[PDB]
Structure 1
Amino acid sequence: EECQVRVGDLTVAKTRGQLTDAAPIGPVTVQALGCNARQVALKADTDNFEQGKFFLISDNNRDKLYVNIRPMDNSAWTTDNGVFYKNDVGSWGGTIGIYVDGQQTNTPPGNYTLTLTGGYWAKDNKQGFTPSGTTGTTKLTVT
């Protein structure tokens, strides 16, 4: 076993201006392999992750939007805006959508990119993550 979380880059086309309250606008393709007894966990890179919050950065660096990820409708996962992992250990591999953290008004942007690291998580609130997979790059298009 091992735990090898595979992920692939994707591009969605929905503007922030729509997302008023936690709505899925970007299903990141994440597929774990061998993680039958491991809690798959995804976490945005330090550039997009600040103090336990996931945010998308502009392509030219301008504005940021805090968003949280969700398994959409796959299985029970432990939500968090800074660390995302599944409480139930076992095989998994389904697209994780991207929600919004209390909107942000949406200032006329063009493109946003966010890097999501993959691996597993242990314990809670102790930042017990481990790189066991691949780092994906999610791109959001806005207007």
Structure 2
Amino acid sequence: EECQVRVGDLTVAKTRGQLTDAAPIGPVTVQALGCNARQVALKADTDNFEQGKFFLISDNNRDKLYVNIRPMDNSAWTTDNGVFYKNDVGSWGGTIGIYVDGQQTNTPPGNYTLTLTGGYWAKDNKQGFTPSGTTGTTKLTVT
């Protein structure tokens, strides 16, 4: 038994310009098993997470964009440029969405893969995160 967060994969066709400040581009129904006294947190895979920051990358690995995973107005989560987590204790069951940090102005997109893994978080700032559960690979495709 551990804090297992089920993050689902999602591929959607959208532009970087549709991301106007806070635009929930796809509602992911995520539920966390356990964590009665632990904080639930979302962390991106090491291929999408560097220096304690999460971002999406293109095929040419030149265009790097940072995206914050926030709740679809379901609860209050602590925003971090690397690991997103809620201060409120207890399990969680709602919908999360990918929000862009600052309007991108629809910079020429293509294919971006961002692997987000759910799990729990320990204390704060120290980056004591552990991905337990399911990992959700979100694919950003322009069409």
Identity %: 100
Q: CA deviation digits over 1:60-105, x for unaligned, max 9?
A: 5342211111111111211112111111011212221111111334
Runs of 4+ residues deviating >6 angstroms? none
More strand by share: 2
Q: Could you tell me the TM-score, scaled by structure 1's length?
A: 0.87
Cα distance change, pair 29–137 in 1 and its aligned pair in 2 (3 A)? farther
Shift of 1:15: 0.8
Secondary structure of residue in 1 paired with 2:52: coil
Q: CA deviation digits over 1:96-126, x for unaligned, max 9?
A: 1111111334332222110011110011111
Secondary structure of residue in 1 paired with 2:53: coil
Alignment RMSD (CA, Å): 1.8
Any conservation in 2 of the 1:68–1:99 contact (CA below 8 Å)? Answer: yes
Between the aligned partners of 1:26 and 1:51, the Cα distance in structure 2 is 27
Q: Could you tell me the TM-score, scaled by structure 2's length?
A: 0.87
> Which moved further from structure 2: 65-74 or 55-64?
55-64
Shift of 1:7: 1.7
Unpaired stretches in structure 1, ≥5 consecutive residues: none
Unpaired stretches in structure 2, ≥5 consecutive residues: none
Any conservation in 1 of the 2:43–2:131 contact (CA below 8 Å)? Answer: no
Cα distance change, pair 23–64 in 1 and its aligned pair in 2 (3 A)? same
Between the aligned partners of 2:9 and 2:132, the Cα distance in structure 1 is 17
Secondary structure of residue in 2 paired with 1:95: strand
